[PDB]
Amino acid sequence: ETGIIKRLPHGAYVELHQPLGPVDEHGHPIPLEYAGAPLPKRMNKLGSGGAPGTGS
């Protein structure tokens, strides 16, 4: 869950999701199988925040 809320033209409120794997033709991600490893829950931990800028 990226935390970004979007209003559809007909008034629907949906939250943008970041898939961790392949997606469908409709856009919904393919469900993944648990592998005993921790799963990301924050977009900033996936590198969405970028870097401030090289320098002092």
């Binding site: 900033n44 925040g49 970028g50 870097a51 401030p52 800028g53 320098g55």
Partner: protein
């Protein structure tokens, strides 16, 4: 095209924070009306040779804080950091200056249990000093966030709302400084 939600939330809270200082102001005025003619009474001797330079430093910190806002609105994270570091240093100097005033006032017999004037003076100025310390913490926390991710508009919003609190703190001190050191 829309109002800044964080700015509205900060301004709304800043207005409520003023009522907290209203209670402290009421205590000072209530004790002043019961002074009987001596306000401040002996042996309290306020000196403006230190309060005035300390007050001027806090006022000058607002200008450099505003300069950081201009850099933040310009997208220059490095300009924002330079001005906010300078603002933090002068804000720290204000705390040290107030504490140095506190030490000499205590040595001369002006303390919280010592007199009614000491109670209102230290509560009013001390709680403001706590607000200054909280503002210095906000500067450090915001500047630490500047090294974590790229300079985004939401990050620039956080810089602006922090300056709102700093401007509120500076304006409150001017009311406190004029009411205590001039309207005796």
């Amino acid at each position: 095209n829309r109002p800044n939600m964080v700015s509205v939330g900060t301004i709304v809270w800043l207005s409520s924070e003023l009522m907290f200082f209203a209670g402290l102001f009421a205590m000072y005025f209530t004790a002043r009306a019961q002074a009987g003619g001596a306000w401040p009474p002996e042996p309290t001797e306020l000196n403006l040779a230190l309060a005035v330079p300390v007050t001027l430093v806090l006022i000058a910190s607002s200008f450099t804080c505003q300069m950081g806002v201009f850099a933040a609105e310009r997208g220059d994270v490095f300009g924002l950091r330079r001005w906010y570091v300078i603002t933090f240093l002068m804000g720290l100097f204000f705390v040290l200056g107030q504490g140095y005033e506190y030490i000499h006032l205590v040595e001369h017999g002006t303390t919280i249990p010592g007199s009614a004037y000491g109670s209102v003076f230290y509560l009013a100025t001390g709680f403001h000093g706590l607000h200054v310390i909280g503002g210095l913490v906000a500067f450090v926390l915001l500047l630490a966030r500047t090294k974590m991710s790229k300079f985004t508009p939401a990050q620039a919003t956080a810089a602006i709302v922090v300056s709102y609190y700093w401007h509120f703190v500076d304006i409150v001190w001017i009311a406190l400084f004029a009411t205590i050191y001039f309207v005796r």
